[PDB]
């Protein structure tokens, strides 16, 4: 059984790749991503729309209440193992994502060293400049209003009533920014939605940069693959 593995920084179009290979192939893509295991921040954590899914399968290491904490590294890993393991008689899987801690566990761990073949594919952050162009567009998306999906701001809105959420939202990329930036300009999170079109662009531009930095750490902390 084949592990097509795809990883890299935060906006390298990994997902869409996986969706393609998943389409041509009929495989499920497992998501290598702690944060995205919290469907109450679907959008903000970067889960694709169900319509962007193209009828393929995307599998999450688990699914849990923001307030139960972001799934810690180790479990994700044991979880991974299992999700891969009980499918071992299918043809291949895709494994796709950007969790640093998850890939290092892969790298160090004995499970993965045997039993399968690989088709690893690693994307690298290219120029800063063109990353922010991408990131900006991508955030704009997450800010788009829509019948199917809450937006980034709204996930934060709703979720900002329950107080145990707040130190976790402060910890997760994009959200940190959203808070720090309302606390900057003295609005309440609940209001971020109606941020007139001027301050909109900074707040976009801001996240864009928050990601940029992340990208940048993913870069210096990924492992490279055997």
Structure description:
Strand 2, helix 2 (42-45) and strand 3 (57-60) form a beta-alpha-beta unit. The chain has nine helices and five strands. It is of the alpha/beta class. The relative contact order is 0.19. Helix content is 45%, strand content 12%. The protein folds into two domains: 1-124, 3-Layer(aba) Sandwich (Rossmann fold); 125-226, Crystal structure of tRNA isopentenylpyrophosphate transferase (bh2366) domain (Helix Hairpins), CATH 1.10.287.890. The longest helix has 25 residues, at 197-221. The chain has a five-stranded parallel β-sheet with strand order 3-2-4-1-5, with helices on both faces. The protein has helices spanning 14-25, 42-45, 73-85, 100-108, 128-143, 152-158, 165-169, 175-184, 197-221; strands spanning 2-7, 28-31, 57-60, 92-97, 117-122. This is Adenylate dimethylallyltransferase. One of its GO terms (biological process) is cytokinin biosynthetic process.
Short description:
This is Adenylate dimethylallyltransferase. It is an enzyme of class 2 (transferase). The protein is 45% helix and 12% strand.
Topology:
Layout: E1 2-7, H1 14-25, E2 28-31, H2 42-45, E3 57-60, H3 73-85, E4 92-97, H4 100-108, E5 117-122, H5 128-143, H6 152-158, H7 165-169, H8 175-184, H9 197-221
């Amino acid at each position: 059984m084949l592990l097509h593995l795809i990883y890299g920084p935060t906006c390298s179009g990994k997902t869409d790749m996986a969706i393609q290979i998943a389409q041509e192939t009929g495989w499920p893509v497992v998501a290598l991503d702690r944060v995205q295991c919290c469907p109450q921040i679907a959008t903000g954590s970067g889960r694709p729309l169900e319509s962007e899914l193209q009828s393929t399968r995307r599998i999450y290491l688990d699914s849990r209440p923001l307030t139960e904490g972001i799934l810690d590294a180790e479990s994700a890993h044991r979880r991974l193992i299992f999700e891969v393991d009980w499918r071992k008689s299918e043809e291949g899987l895709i494994l796709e994502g950007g969790s640093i801690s998850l890939l290092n566990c892969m790298a160090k761990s004995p499970f993965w060293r045997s039993g399968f073949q690989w088709h690893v594919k690693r994307l690298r952050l290219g120029d800063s400049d063109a990353f922010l162009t991408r990131a900006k567009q991508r955030v704009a998306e997450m800010f788009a209003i829509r019948e199917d999906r809450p937006s980034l701001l709204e996930e934060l809105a709703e979720l900002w009533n329950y107080p145990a959420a707040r130190p976790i939202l402060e910890d997760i990329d994009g959200y940190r920014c959203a808070i720090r930036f309302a606390r900057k300009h003295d609005l309440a999170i609940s209001q971020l939605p109606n941020i007139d079109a001027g301050r909109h662009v900074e707040l976009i531009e801001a996240i864009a940069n928050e990601y940029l930095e992340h990208a940048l750490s993913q870069e210096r902390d990924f492992p490279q693959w055997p």
